[PDB]
Each structure stands twice: as C-alpha cells, then as structure tokens.
Amino acid sequence: SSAESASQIPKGQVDLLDFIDWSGVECLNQSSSHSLPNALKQGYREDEGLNLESDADEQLLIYIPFNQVIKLHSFAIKGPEEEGPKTVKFFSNKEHMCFSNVNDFPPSDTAELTEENLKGKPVVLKYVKFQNVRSLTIFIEANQSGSEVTKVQKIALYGST
C-alpha cells in the first residue's frame, strides 16, 4: 500500500512506513482495548481518539513484516514522557516469535527512548546488523518511568535500503 500522511523523510534514511507489508502485521497485544494502526499508520496517531497503549501488559510485542528488504538505520517512537517505551528490543530476520523466545535470543538492537526520540527524532541503531529486513519484531517490555502503563503516539522506522 502507498501509505503516507505527514512523514518527513530526511536525506540518509527513508521511511519504512510505506515499506511495511501491513497485511501480515501481527500483534500479541496491540492494546487489549485498542488496535495496532493507531500508532503506526500515520494519520491515526492522534492521542485523543486512538493510540497504541499497554492495556494491562506493559510488555508489548508487535510483529511487523515488510514488503521489501531494506536496512533499518534509525527509529522514532513517541509517547508521553512518563508512559513512553524505554526498553525497546527488536529482532529482525525472524518471522514469528513470541516473547518467551525473545528472552533466549539476542535482540537485533536494544534501544532506549531518548528525550529526543520522544520528540520524533530518528535515533540511529546498529545498522551493521540490519542488512536484510523482511521481518522486524518490536518488543517493548519496559517504559520510561516505570509507570506501569505505556502509551505510544507514533512509531516510525527509518531505513537506508
């Protein structure tokens, strides 16, 4: 799908929103009372009506398959400062995995929500590992302030093909 809205693609990294498969997206939570598109598909990212949150489980597992193989270069996740996801783990090159196994397998990268990330700034991660991305699972287990509840306004991944 050709999917944009208000995405700012700089020079260095391209948005992966349009590179997402969308059809095979899978969520083992996606908010027990909310849906996934809320924070990922730009446009619905308005924390007023719909957002991606942790309903009860602060630990959230979201699986995103892509339509093309690109390299993940930078990531951008936003939410509230207290309810923002800090412990961000990713794992690519693996289609289908629940968090039980994510504990035994080393993540692709483990990021922290920086205050700048919280503003919509693409933070660069280990590009040396992201060479082939057909699949990317995002496992967020802990939030910024340990506030029990986590809220996500928007998720954006930027890659460099």
UniProtKB/Swiss-Prot annotation:
Name the domain of life this protein comes from: Eukaryota
**At which residues is N-acetylserine found?**
2
Instruction: Cite the entry's keywords alphabetically.
Output: Acetylation
The answer to whether UniProt assigns keyword GTP-binding to this entry is no
Q: Which intervals hold domain PITH?
A: 5-161
Q: Which InterPro entries match?
A: Galactose-bd-like_sf, PITH1-like, PITH_dom, PITH_dom_sf
**What do the Gene Ontology cellular component annotations say?**
cytosol
Q: Which PANTHER family match?
A: AD039 HT014 THIOREDOXIN FAMILY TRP26 (PTHR12175), OS03G0795500 PROTEIN (PTHR12175:SF5)
Q: Which family does it belong to?
A: Belongs to the PITHD1 family.
Q: What is the name attached to this protein's record?
A: PITH domain-containing protein At3g04780
